[PDB]
Amino acid sequence: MFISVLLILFALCVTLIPEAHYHMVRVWSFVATIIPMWVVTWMWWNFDASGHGLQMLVILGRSHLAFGIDGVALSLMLLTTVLFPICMMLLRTVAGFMTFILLEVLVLSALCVLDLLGFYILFEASLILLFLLIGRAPYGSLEAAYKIVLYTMAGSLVLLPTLFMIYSECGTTNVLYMTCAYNHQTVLGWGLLAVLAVKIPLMPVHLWLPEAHVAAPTAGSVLLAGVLLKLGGIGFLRFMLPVVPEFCVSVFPLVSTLCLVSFLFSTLSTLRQIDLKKIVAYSSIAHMSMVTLAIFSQSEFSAYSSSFLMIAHGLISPALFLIVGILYDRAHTKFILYFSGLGASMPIGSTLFFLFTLGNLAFPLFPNFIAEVLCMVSIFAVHELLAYVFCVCQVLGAAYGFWAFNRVVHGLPRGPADVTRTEFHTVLPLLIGAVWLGIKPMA
């Protein structure tokens, strides 16, 4: 807590640096995100895996805002602290540095909060930052920014009275006493489903993602894909399943059909896309549908497998966004028809593209393979057909993945030259994390 105050105050000192010292501004904003990565690694060192489920607790009196660490929050916090310095390497202005610093404060505090009102306050305080990040004046899109902000606001406004309903019902929004009291679970369950089915892209409230994740800059796309979608999953695992479990059983056919149609229809839409960033953007919806069904199965080790799929997606899809961002930065287009023969002109970039293509399709020696196997073990244990639907549709994911790769990488060599040292080192931590988590993830 004292450490967190010191890290925030060190991060906020970027504004006071005079702008004529360019080197100092770059180094200060990069170190301001490097330090929380070290602190979260130390928190992993301090964790007792044979101890209590909630460790390193702190509660700030009668102000809500109570905090604690479990395994899902700790893995997601480690992933966020990895992803934020890479975002710092892709920005050039103090406005970008400050927006991403404020976003990192809000994400890190939202991932480990234990109060529902605290979760509401901390998460969607990032709405105006996302609006300004997506609708930036010369190269953004105001339509996309309006869509993402309005969908998130709609879901949050459905949740807010139900939050206050359980608060008047039992006397607290602390999740440890909300899980032990008697509450009207249908109303609160519908409010929580309303927020987290927009955060996780679940059809029909999913149309904001294709616009926002493409109109964003490369750093914004890395953040939005790798981090902000998983707040819906940790919302399911931390707040909704412990507090309204009767609802979570009774809504299972509806959540199940939403997940199945989201998976199938989003995979079918990904095949007709002609923009590389839109191809990468749609593929995330099917993965999150598998995550949601694995969470809702509650069957074998469902929290473990679903968290592991969230980590595998958060490693693999930001790297695909990084490669598309390199192509866009040095060729000024994201259109497939302008790219051919990238193997001959960018051999290192095409090799990285192929490896992350194989990772996104859940091939072995990548963490997505272990993730999808364990998620389908959790789904299979409820019924065999709910697993069969995901199993037989694997040709549809590989079709779009290999079609996009084969169209842009082979053929007549036209396009930009190979990657620089900076682009390679933006990609590199994700590759090392993927090789480790896909070969020896546990000990």
Partner 1 sequence: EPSWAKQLAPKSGLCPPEFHYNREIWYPHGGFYCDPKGWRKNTLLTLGGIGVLLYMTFSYSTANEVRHMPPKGWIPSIMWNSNVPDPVDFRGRKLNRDGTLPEGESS
Partner 2 sequence: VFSGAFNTPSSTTAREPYAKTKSSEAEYGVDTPVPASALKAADKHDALAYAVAN
Partner 3 sequence: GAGAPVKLAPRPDKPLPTWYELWWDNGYYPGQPAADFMFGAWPGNMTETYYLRFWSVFGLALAAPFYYVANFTDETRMPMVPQQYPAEVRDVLVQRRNSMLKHDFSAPDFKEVKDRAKIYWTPMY
Ligand X SMILES: CCCCCCCCCCCCCCCCCC(=O)O[C@@H](COC(=O)CCCCCCCCCCCCCCC)COP(=O)(O)OCC[N+](C)(C)C
Ligand Y SMILES: CCCCCCCCCCCCCCCCCCCC(=O)O[C@H](COC(=O)CCCCCCCCCCCCCC)COP(=O)(O)OCCN
Q: Which residues bind ligand X (CB under 6 A)?
A: 12, 15, 44, 47, 49, 51, 53, 71-72, 74-75, 78-79, 82, 94-95, 98-99, 102, 128, 303-304, 307-308, 311, 429, 432-433, 437, 441-442
Decide whether 216 or 408 has the Cβ nearer to partner 3: 408
Q: Does 248 bind partner 2 (CB under 8 A)?
A: yes
Locate 253 and state its tokens. 């056919």
Locate 179 and state its tokens. 């899980």
Q: Measured at CB, which residue is nearest to ligand X?
A: 433
Binding residues for partner 2, total number by CB under 8 A: 21
Binding residue (CB under 6 A) for ligand 3PH from 129, 165, 260, 331: 260
d(CA 229, CA 122): 15
CB-CB neighbours of 290 under 10 Å: 23
Nearest C-alpha neighbor of 294 from the set 391, 190, 377, 360: 377
Binding residue (CB under 8 A) for partner 1 from 345, 377, 399, 431: 345
Please choose which of ligand PGT, partner 3, ligand 3PH, none residue 260 contacts, taking the beta carbon within 5 to 8 angstroms, the exact cut-off set by kind.
ligand 3PH
Contact (Cβ atoms closer than 8 angstroms) between residue 423 and residue 326: yes
Please choose which of partner 3, ligand PGT, ligand 3PH, none residue 7 contacts, taking the beta carbon within 5 to 8 angstroms, the exact cut-off set by kind.
ligand PGT
CB-CB neighbours of 255 under 10 Å: 19
Please choose which of partner 1, ligand 3PH, partner 2, none residue 347 contacts, taking the beta carbon within 5 to 8 angstroms, the exact cut-off set by kind.
partner 1
The dihedral built from the CA positions of residue 292, 297, 299 and 300, taken in this order, carries a sign that is negative
d(CA 177, CA 181): 6
d(CA 380, CA 220): 36
Decide whether 96 or 210 has the Cβ nearer to ligand X: 96
d(CA 47, CA 29): 29
**Near ligand PGT by CB under 6 A, which window of 101-109, 214-222, 242-250, 399-407?**
101-109
Please choose which of partner 2, partner 1, partner 3, none residue 411 contacts, taking the beta carbon within 5 to 8 angstroms, the exact cut-off set by kind.
partner 3
Q: Does 12 bind ligand PGT (CB under 6 A)?
A: no
Decide whether 78 or 260 has the Cβ nearer to ligand 3PH: 260
Binding residue (CB under 8 A) for partner 1 from 15, 93, 351, 420: 351
Helix (H, G, I), strand (E, B) or coil at 232: helix
Nearest C-alpha neighbor of 130 from the set 116, 144, 118: 144
Contact (Cβ atoms closer than 8 angstroms) between residue 378 and residue 294: yes
Binding residue (CB under 8 A) for partner 2 from 64, 199, 206, 238: 238
Decide whether 176 or 264 has the Cβ nearer to ligand 3PH: 264
- By CB atoms closer than 10 A (0-12, 13-18, 19+), residue 242 is middle
Q: Does 414 bind partner 3 (CB under 8 A)?
A: yes
Fill in the DSSP letter of residue 206: T
- By CB atoms closer than 10 A (0-12, 13-18, 19+), residue 420 is exposed
Which residues lie near partner 2 (CB under 8 A)?
52-54, 70-72, 176, 179, 237-238, 241-243, 245, 248-249, 298, 301, 303-304, 307
Which residues lie near partner 1 (CB under 8 A)?
344-345, 347-348, 351, 417-418
